[PDB]
């Protein structure tokens, strides 16, 4: 009675069909049976990584027994799964727990060879005492079966430490299934999710949800890292087929919130607030417009679907009538229906029939959208709005960087070549090095690129190679070996990519580092991974590595290349993408930097409503004064500051330039007045 009291049957649940299909894994069940029905050491223990499927095999064996496909001496066994969590509970006296264990063991002893005990998470029996050692006597006679399943490391962490027991067990290895076996298991399990949710599931989806989740989720194992995607896409589609679909359910909520905020911002007795109120209304209206446009779209197709349906119904009614005409022998209506009314409505149906958005089944891209919500990595289809930004990318980078089209092109052509699903999948999404004279942009372009993709300049992982001067500093970006002072901290680079692996990495002044920090970027590049202290393996197959330097600084093109081939390894300059070289600024190009800097300054002193008004000779002199062709565009910034900001501050903190003003600037013989 103790068995039915504490433990729980498994074959009884199998009889009610409460288990899931167990597609595949015949070799492992064969091995488990041929080990279980042995004479001695009749105790199998399943060993495998978490997620490979280790309880599923035992459920499959239970199904096989209840079906009757097992060898001779395995008929009507009634496998039982223990529960020590329920066994040791409220047994708060000296002689209760071991007594209950003795009772269970004796009730198992009674049944000669029927009961096949099963313990999931076998490692829980190493303690449980204050005991748990009343298993060696029974296993010393082969009186139990006791199939168990644990993970790989907990085995050597809780059992191998007790090498007496490990002698009495027989190991079975369970490796992860490959992509085809995973597709098979998914095609087997599709039905249960189809019935639990309320939607259909195609097969191209079951193929994509297996080929993707092996490439992107590099932390789990197939039989579940593939199931999760489908089981999330199904629920998303059910929620969509409920009240209004996604991409409307967000615009509506943004519009309502904007209306609420404006309804109380309007009643403000201020002047600073009177200008921020003039943009709130603008955006609210410009989004009301989009909500209206989107609403009509989904509202129609809706009607079209209903039309089609009606036409189907009508058709069928006529078909039923042609049957009847033949039942009644009515020729007048017989063919009138059979080649008149029926094909008439059929054609009408067919004409409306082509009538996307929320079709009614999880396509091959809902899985991709789920994977994109996961891991932040976007793998979609260039949904007709981003394919315009990815064409204006160059002209848009031209808003912050000027000139250097030779580099802006080779930077842009490294993103579309990955969006179009073309570039190699085992290499970073692009890793190339800038080098040239100082003050040209080789750091500003990396910032402009890292903002084109995230809209916040601080979201790029950044490490300065000017500190890593010796070997022993390499451990700063990889963590520390096992068992040292700083070990619960991990690395500094690695940890910024193991979370949100879509960032953009920037190595500043690569040549200032010790030529052993170079020796880890060898396997960073051209393979896209490295191993930190804890043995983990992060994956750079989606990052965009960028490197800057200042080598040579004087050569046309061959002296800088000589410096590179002398200070870099051939097997390290052989892995990179195009090695771009910048040109330098010209007396013409400086005006388009001058006006950018002046707009920057106007935006800076704009929180106090203090816009400027610059003159044409002012800009021309300001560009023709600071130009020297050795320090790039920094002297221009210094000159702007020293020539405008100091006079402006002198005038400002002496009154007379109070808030809400606009001062004009004009040229005097050498300096410029205000």
What are the binding residues for ATP? Answer: 48-55, 436-443
**Cβ nearer to ligand AGS, comparing 223 with 552:** 223
499 binds, among ligand AGS, other proteins, none (CB under 5 to 8 A by kind): other proteins
276 binds, among ligand AGS, other proteins, none (CB under 5 to 8 A by kind): other proteins
**Count of beta carbons in the 10 Å neighbourhood of residue 29:** 19
Both structure tokens of 199: 């939607």
Interface with ligand AGS, residue 51, by CB under 6 A: yes
Binding residues, by number, are: 48-55, 436-443
Q: Cα–Cα distance between 303 and 356 in angstroms, integer?
A: 14
**Cβ nearer to ligand AGS, comparing 50 with 617:** 50
Interface with ligand AGS, residue 190, by CB under 6 A: no
Helices (H) then strands (E): counts for the chain? 30, 19
Q: What angle do CA 111, 112, 115 make, to 5 degrees?
A: 60
Interface with ligand AGS, residue 637, by CB under 6 A: yes
Interface with ligand AGS, residue 433, by CB under 6 A: no
CB 175 within 8 A of CB 181: no
Min CB(510)–ligand AGS separation in Å: 11
| Residue closest to 240 by CA, chosen among 203, 191, 199, 294 | 199
Residues between 532 and 561 with contacts to ligand AGS, criterion CB under 6 A: 548, 550
Q: What angle do CA 372, 500, 538 make, to 5 degrees?
A: 110
Min CB(22)–ligand AGS separation in Å: 5
Q: What angle do CA 463, 469, 474 make, to 5 degrees?
A: 65
Residues between 397 and 416 with contacts to ligand AGS, criterion CB under 6 A: 401-402
Q: Cα–Cα distance between 480 and 535 in angstroms, integer?
A: 11
**Cβ nearer to other proteins, comparing 313 with 457:** 457
Interface with ligand AGS, residue 442, by CB under 6 A: yes
Do the bridges between strand 504-508 and strand 117-120 make them parallel or antiparallel, or are there none, so unpaired?
unpaired
**Count of beta carbons in the 10 Å neighbourhood of residue 465:** 20
Min CB(272)–other proteins separation in Å: 5
Residues between 222 and 281 with contacts to ligand AGS, criterion CB under 6 A: 223-224, 227
56 binds, among other proteins, ligand AGS, none (CB under 5 to 8 A by kind): ligand AGS
Number of residues that this document lists for the chain = 674
Give the HSE-up count for residue 65: Cα atoms under 13 Å, Cβ half-sphere. Answer: 25
Torsions phi, psi for 584 (to 5 deg): 115, 160
CB 631 within 8 A of CB 439: yes
Long-range contacts of 627-635 (CB under 8 A, 24+ apart): 627/587, 627/590, 629/584, 629/585, 630/437, 631/438, 631/439, 632/437, 632/438, 632/439, 632/440, 632/584, 632/585, 633/439, 633/440, 633/585, 633/590, 633/593, 634/439
Min CB(60)–ligand AGS separation in Å: 7
Min CB(128)–ligand AGS separation in Å: 19
Crossing angle of the two packed helices 386-397 and 444-452, in degrees rounded to 10: 160
**Cβ nearer to other proteins, comparing 231 with 346:** 231
**Count of beta carbons in the 10 Å neighbourhood of residue 436:** 23
Cβ neighbours of residue 132 under 8 Å, at least 6 residues apart?
A: 125, 126
**Cβ nearer to other proteins, comparing 228 with 527:** 228
Please name every residue paired with 248 in a beta bridge, in sequence order, or none if there are none. Answer: none
634 binds, among other proteins, ligand AGS, none (CB under 5 to 8 A by kind): ligand AGS
Both structure tokens of 276: 């921020």
Q: Cα–Cα distance between 208 and 211 in angstroms, integer?
A: 5
**Cβ nearer to ligand AGS, comparing 349 with 644:** 644
Among 4, 34, 55, 171, binds ligand AGS (CB under 6 A): 55
Interface with ligand AGS, residue 50, by CB under 6 A: yes
Min CB(644)–other proteins separation in Å: 23
Q: Cα–Cα distance between 455 and 149 in angstroms, integer?
A: 48
Dump the DSSP string for 25-63: -HHHHHHHHHHHTSSS---EEEE--TTS-SHHHHHHHHH
Min CB(464)–ligand AGS separation in Å: 11
490 binds, among other proteins, ligand AGS, none (CB under 5 to 8 A by kind): other proteins
Q: Cα–Cα distance between 374 and 360 in angstroms, integer?
A: 23
270 binds, among ligand AGS, other proteins, none (CB under 5 to 8 A by kind): other proteins
376 binds, among ligand AGS, other proteins, none (CB under 5 to 8 A by kind): other proteins
Number of residue whose CB is nearest ligand AGS? 53
**Cβ nearer to other proteins, comparing 269 with 384:** 269
Among 443, 531, 567, 647, binds ligand AGS (CB under 6 A): 443
The stretch near ligand AGS (CB under 6 A) out of 49-57, 497-505, 510-518, 527-535 is 49-57
Q: What angle do CA 175, 29, 21 make, to 5 degrees?
A: 90
Among 2, 9, 12, 23, binds ligand AGS (CB under 6 A): 23
**Cβ nearer to ligand AGS, comparing 56 with 87:** 56
438 binds, among other proteins, ligand AGS, none (CB under 5 to 8 A by kind): ligand AGS
CB 148 within 8 A of CB 48: no
Coil, helix or strand at residue 97: helix
Among 65, 70, 159, 185, binds ligand AGS (CB under 6 A): 185
Min CB(231)–other proteins separation in Å: 10
Residues between 570 and 599 with contacts to ligand AGS, criterion CB under 6 A: 593
52 binds, among other proteins, ligand AGS, none (CB under 5 to 8 A by kind): ligand AGS
- Site size with ligand AGS, rule: CB under 6 A: 35
Interface with ligand AGS, residue 125, by CB under 6 A: no
Q: Cα–Cα distance between 502 and 543 in angstroms, integer?
A: 6
Give the chain's largest Cα–Cα span.
113
Q: Which residues bind other proteins (CB under 8 A)?
A: 50-51, 84-85, 120-121, 124, 127-128, 151, 154, 220, 224, 228, 257, 261, 264-265, 268, 270, 272-273, 276, 376, 456, 488, 490, 495, 499-500, 607
- Secondary structure in 3-state letters for 196-210: HCCCEECHHHHHHHH
Cβ neighbours of residue 416 under 8 Å, at least 6 residues apart?
A: 390, 393
**Cβ nearer to ligand AGS, comparing 439 with 552:** 439
Min CB(651)–ligand AGS separation in Å: 25
Query: For binding to ligand AGS (CB under 6 A), which residues are involved?
Result: 20-25, 50-56, 151, 185, 189, 223-224, 227, 401-402, 438-444, 548, 550, 593, 632-634, 637
């Amino acid at each position: 009675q103790a068995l039915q009291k504490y433990s729980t049957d498994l074959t009884a649940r199998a009889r009610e069909g409460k288990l899931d299909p167990v597609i595949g894994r015949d070799n492992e069940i064969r091995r488990v049976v041929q080990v279980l029905s042995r004479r001695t050491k009749n105790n199998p223990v399943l060993i495998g990584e978490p997620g490979v499927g280790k309880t599923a095999i035992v459920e499959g064996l239970a199904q096989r027994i209840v079906a009757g496909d097992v060898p001779e001496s395995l008929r009507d066994k009634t496998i039982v799964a223990l529960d020590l969590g329920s066994m040791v509970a409220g047994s708060k006296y000296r002689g209760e727990f071991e007594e209950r264990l003795k009772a269970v063991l004796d009730d198992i002893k009674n049944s000669a060879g029927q009961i096949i005990t099963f313990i999931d998470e076998l490692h829980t029996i190493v303690g449980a005492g204050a005991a748990g050692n009343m298993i060696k006597p029974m296993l010393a006679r082969g009186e139990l079966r006791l199939v168990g399943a644990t993970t790989l490391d907990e085995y050597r962490k809780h059992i191998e430490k007790d090498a007496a027991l490990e002698r009495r067990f027989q190991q079975v290895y369970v490796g992860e299934p490959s992509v085809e076996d995973t597709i098979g298991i998914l095609r087997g399990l599709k039905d249960r999710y189809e019935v639990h949710h309320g939607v259909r599931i195609t097969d191209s989806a079951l193929v994509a949800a297996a080929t993707l989740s092996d490439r992107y989720i590099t932390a789990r194992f197939l039989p579940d890292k593939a199931i999760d995607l489908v089981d999330e896409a199904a629920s998303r589609l059910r929620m969509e087929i409920d009240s209004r679909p996604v991409e409307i359910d967000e615009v509506e909520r943004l519009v309502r919130r904007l209306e609420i905020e404006e309804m109380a911002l309007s009643k403000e007795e201020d002047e600073a607030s009177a200008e921020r109120l003039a943009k709130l209304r603008s955006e609210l209206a410009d989004q009301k417009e989009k909500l209206a446009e989107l609403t009509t779209r989904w509202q129609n197709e809706k009607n079209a679907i209903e039309i089609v349906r009606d036409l189907k119904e009508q058709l069928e009614a006529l078909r039923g009538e042609s049957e009847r005409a033949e039942r009644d022998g009515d020729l007048a209506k017989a063919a009138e229906l059979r080649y008149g009314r029926i094909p008439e409505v059929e054609k009408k149906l067919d004409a409306a029939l082509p009538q996307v958005m929320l079709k009614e089944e999880v396509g091959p891209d809902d899985i991709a959208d789920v994977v994109s919500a996961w891991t932040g990595i976007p793998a979609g289809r260039l949904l007709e709005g981003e394919t315009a930004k990815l064409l204006r990318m160059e002209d848009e980078l031209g808003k912050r960087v000027i000139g250097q089209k030779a580099a802006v092109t080779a930077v842009s052509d490294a993103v579309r070549r990955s969006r179009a699903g073309v570039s190699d999948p085992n290499r970073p999404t692009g890793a190339f090095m800038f080098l040239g004279p100082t003050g040209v942009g080789k750091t500003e372009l990396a910032k402009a690129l890292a903002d084109f993709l995230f809209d916040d300049e601080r979201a790029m992982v950044r490490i300065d190679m000017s500190e890593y001067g010796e070997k022993h500093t390499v451990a700063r970006l990889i963590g520390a070996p096992p068992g040292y002072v700083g070990y619960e901290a991990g690395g500094q680079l690695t940890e910024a990519v193991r979370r949100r692996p879509y960032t953009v990495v920037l190595f500043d002044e690569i040549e200032k580092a010790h030529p052993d920090v170079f020796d880890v970027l060898l396997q960073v590049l051209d393979e896209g991974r490295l191993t930190d202290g804890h043995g983990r393996t992060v994956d750079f197959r989606n990052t965009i590595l960028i490197l800057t330097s200042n080598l040579g600084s004087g050569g046309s093109a061959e002296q800088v290349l000589a410096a590179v081939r002398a200070t870099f390894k051939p097997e390290f300059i052989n892995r990179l993408d195009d090695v771009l070289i910048f040109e330098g600024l010209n007396p013409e190009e400086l005006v388009r930097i001058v006006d950018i800097q002046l707009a920057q300054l106007g935006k800076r002193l704009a929180q106090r409503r203090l816009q400027l008004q610059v003159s044409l000779p002012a800009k021309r002199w300001l560009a023709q004064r600071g130009f020297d062709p050795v320090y790039g565009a920094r002297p221009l910034r210094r000159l702007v500051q020293q020539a405008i900001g100091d006079q402006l501050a002198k005038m400002l903190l002496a009154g007379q330039v109070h808030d809400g003003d606009t001062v004009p600037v004009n040229v005097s013989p050498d300096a410029d007045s205000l």
